[PDB]
Amino acid sequence: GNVDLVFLFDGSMSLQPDEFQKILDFMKDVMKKLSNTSYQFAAVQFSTSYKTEFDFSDYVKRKDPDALLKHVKHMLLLTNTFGAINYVATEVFREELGARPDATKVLIIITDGEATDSGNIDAAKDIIRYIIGIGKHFQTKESQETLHKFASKPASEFVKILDTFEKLKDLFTELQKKIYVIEG
Numbered sequence: 001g002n003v004d005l006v007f008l009f010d011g012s013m014s015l016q017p018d019e020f021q022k023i024l025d026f027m028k029d030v031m032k033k034l035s036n037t038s039y040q041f042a043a044v045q046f047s048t049s050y051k052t053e054f055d056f057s058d059y060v061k062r063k064d065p066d067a068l069l070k071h072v073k074h075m076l077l078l079t080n081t082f083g084a085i086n087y088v089a090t091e092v093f094r095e096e097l098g099a100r101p102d103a104t105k106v107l108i109i110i111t112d113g114e115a116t117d118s119g120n121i122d123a124a125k126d127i128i129r130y131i132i133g134i135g136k137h138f139q140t141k142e143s144q145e146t147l148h149k150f151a152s153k154p155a156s157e158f159v160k161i162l163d164t165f166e167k168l169k170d171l172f173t174e175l176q177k178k179i180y181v182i183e184g
């Protein structure tokens with residue numbers, strides 16, 4: 001069937017210009033590889049607040065990944081992960097914004113630090129959630145574990161820990177090995 005995938009990327013002040021850019025290039029490569037398929041995308045940047053850089057309707061009309069993420073401004077603030085997810089589940093996955101009712105909802109969270117807010121993400125339970133933690137802020141095992149509550153289970157499947165942003169390329173190569181033409 002169809003798949004509606006949302007990219008929820010970290011825009012905190014911790015992120016260096018080049019690192020932020022590498023997070024955007026990664027998203028584009030994923031989109032480019034899965035173009036002309038039954039996939040539709042939307043990207044949301046989060047820091048203290050949130051902003052939908054482009055929604056499903058925008059993707060359908062434009063398609064070009066580079067153009068959809070050309071006017072992104074690095075927020076350089078905090079990391080309110082909880083509120084961001086909630087925002088995605090109640091303000092992004094909507095028919096008014098090109099979301100398809102039949103589509104399988106997917107969310108790919110990309111962050112470089114522990115959340116600075118608290119709460120719960122119950123509003124997104126019905127969403128398949130992946131999370132990538134990057135950088136030295138996830139040096140200890142305890143810091144990495146804090147991301148488990150945002151991703152689906154098991155953690156070994158929905159939680160990826162990258163020690164450097166350069167490893168995003170390794171992730172993209174590992175991700176492609178899972179691409180298949182399946183009809184039945």
Ligand SMILES: CCOc1ccccc1Sc1ccc(-c2ccnc(N3CCN(C(C)=O)CC3)c2)cc1[N+](=O)[O-]
Pocket residue numbers: 003005030104106108128130131132156157158159160171174175176178
């Ligand atoms: C290759 C393993 O990579 C990771 C491991 C843990 C956390 C994040 C990542 S990156 C990661 C992992 C998976 C996906 C991805 C892309 C398209 N579809 C799916 N599924 C959702 C719908 N499912 C259905 C149809 O039931 C099948 C799988 C997933 C994208 C990323 N990413 O872009 O970033």
